[PDB]
Amino acid sequence: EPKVNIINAQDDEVELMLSDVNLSLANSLRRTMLAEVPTLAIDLVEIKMNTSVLADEFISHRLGLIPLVSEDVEEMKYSRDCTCEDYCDECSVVLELSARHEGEEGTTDVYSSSLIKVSGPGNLNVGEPVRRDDYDQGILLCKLRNHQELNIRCIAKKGIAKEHAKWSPCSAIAFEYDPHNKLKHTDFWFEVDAKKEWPDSKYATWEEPPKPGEVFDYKAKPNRFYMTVETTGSLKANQVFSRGIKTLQEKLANVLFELENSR
Amino acid sequence: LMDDDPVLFNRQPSLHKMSMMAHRVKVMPYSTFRLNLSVTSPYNADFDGDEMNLHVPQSEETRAELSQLCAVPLQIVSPQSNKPVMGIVQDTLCGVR
């Protein structure tokens, strides 16, 4: 009975209309994709020599905020459920950054593309910082002058956006329904006329406007939901959507398991 | 300090007997003190920088004195103008309207 109608679909974003589902389901999906879809992000930084003008925890925050390829992160284990001591190869990804400016003119920029994956649970395709293209330079990390050096050993781990925003696979999940206010779920503020003063929804032309002769319907519930998922490149849009659905499924299965095994 | 301990709670200046009242404790994270919003009127307090003092009674006589004379429920009506001093305020009033 639930139906999906994709309107736009590229790697970073997917725009889709969801229909014949309850509003709670659609909002639960939005929340799950925003908060509970696991990704990979740098969770531990080790400074060897940092003589740049930027501070150590400034650089650590920026490195933690760098998106990394997380396609295979679901075959990986949380670092709190592994028997290992100080990080092993199967529940963490170790990165290296070495940068240095030689000469007495110019500034050397340190970019996220300079991060180098050293270890990690191969041959899983996790860990690499995300590049937009083949010629992408990545994210700006620091700047270096004469004899200033940066030597960092980052650890990347699996986490979700509840613990910290750096694990969020999504930027903004646009979400709306009922462009014409047929259900009267909102009550428009106005000065003279509420129809002239309010802009149309971008999906207004997707639904028939109410006829002047029409009377209010008290049986109609919300039934069509227009939402636009965007990603940060760590996961693809279809991957974000499918893993949000799967995470919700496994949360419900956990509830069912506890209920049945509480008898 | 544990849940439901009576403690004397106070904001300066203490212009009248209802500026210093005994409250039951609930332990929480996040280093601020938490107040129900209807008691901010007798204290004349708001949440834009204010600090308030907490005094812990060190014996049973003082626990009983606090809980049976200074407790918040006992100060709702004031003798100053024989009317209540705690009301519904500041968003619950607009929402109930």
């Binding site: 150590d56 925890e57 969020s168 | 919003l37 307090a45 834009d48 500041q90 968003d91 607009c94 929402g95």
Partner: protein
Amino acid sequence: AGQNAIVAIACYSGYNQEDSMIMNQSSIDRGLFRSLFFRSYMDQEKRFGISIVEEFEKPTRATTLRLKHGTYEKLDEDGLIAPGVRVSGDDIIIGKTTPIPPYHTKRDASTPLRSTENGIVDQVLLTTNQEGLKFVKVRMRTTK
């Protein structure tokens, strides 16, 4: 000296009443209104006479008395902590001894860290004062 936040004016959940205000935890996690803090402690050696002066040095328990209740295990052999070392409250960052006037003949005059603050040592400076006696400034760093 500020940041352009996105602000809604709403009676959302009741936690913003009477000049309270709800802030996005995710925006905090991404660096909104995040700030560095620098505290600098100072200390020097005085001259109480001809050959009676203070000294920067890690005070050993045997020859010293009235030692502070903090830990001394972070000072190098010169009585100074090094930049790059994590420091907690009550920890000593400048060890100093004042001689006892006429073994076990020394008292300590060490400068501990403030009992409230955590952080990381940033820049331990060492020079001499107006009168040529040793002079130390230690700048700590932390993030709020």
